[PDB]
């Protein structure tokens, strides 16, 4: 019973091997008053072989504490690179937030570990996410004054925006032209869930070219290493878009990748409902831009 909890907090690989081949029914998802499961304590202590057994014993990788911390966040806190690698190999959600609004990537940027940064953003992490204090991963990376980390993040986002321009060019045959992003393009892992939510701020410029308009794009994208490729056709995972409790409607009835986006100045709330494919390896690049109608 209790024996496995303290065993996992400490080093007892033989004990766990026997308990895992023994004829006793153990709940490997029990949470103490704090809420930590065996998976996240094991990840807290860098005891990797325990993690391999826990994964091969059917243990939720993506649990959460009462303050919203998953095992992956714990691993990121204490620089246990090998543990992060195995969790990402186990289908762990990367972009979950704590009650304070911080993600794993932010911890890795804060402590200056470039390797974790590469590993998570390559597996589809979102850089522009903000905490309750409106600091992004990028601000932490630059204040920690670790050049490799902030170069990595900056080049990653440069690549994302570049591919957005390229794909819209390809799909509208250049009769249309992007002008200025409305709000930092975000990234969503479909395997993480069917819901998507965010809060942003919109500040219009004085000079609005008459005949120009705002559109929301949901590019369906794949990350292969450092290369990202995206599409605005084919299978769509978008069912509904809600901007401030007002549904937004697609510009076309044949596709659900481009929606009309008429935000009001100041704070805005966006929430999208998606299809459920827990095994989908698809990333969604969500961005609302102004555009010119040629």
Residue numbers in the entry: 567 to 860
Excerpt from the paper describing this PDB structure:
A 3.04 Å resolution crystal structure of MPP8 CTD (residues 563–860) was determined by molecular replacement using the AlphaFold prediction for the CTD as the search model. The crystal structure reveals a bipartite fold consisting of five ankyrin (helix-loop-helix) repeats followed by a β-sandwich domain. The last α-helix of the ankyrin repeats, helix α 10, is twice as long as the other ankyrin-repeat helices and extends along the β-sandwich domain. The β-sandwich is tightly packed onto the ankyrin repeats and helix α 10. One of the β-sheets (strands β1, β4, β5 and β9) wraps around the C-terminal half of helix α 10. A structural similarity search with DALI34 revealed structural similarity of the MPP8 b-sandwich domain (residues 741–860) to the PINIT domains of the Siz/PIAS RING family of SUMO E3 ligases. The domains have the same topology and overall fold (2.3–2.5 Å RMSD, Z-score 8.4–9.4), although the Siz/PIAS PINIT domains have a flexible N-terminal linker in place of the rigid helical linker (helix α 10) in MPP8. We therefore conclude that in the context of the reducing intracellular environment the disulfide bond and dimer interface observed in the crystal are unlikely to be physiologically relevant.
In vertebrates, the Human Silencing Hub (HUSH) is a key repressor of retrotransposons, the subset of TEs that can replicate by retrotransposition. The HUSH complex consists of three proteins: TASOR (Transgene activation suppressor), MPP8 (M-phase phosphoprotein 8), and Periphilin-1 (PPLHN1, isoform 2).11 Periphilin targets HUSH to its genomic loci by binding to nascent transcripts with exons longer than 1.5 kb.
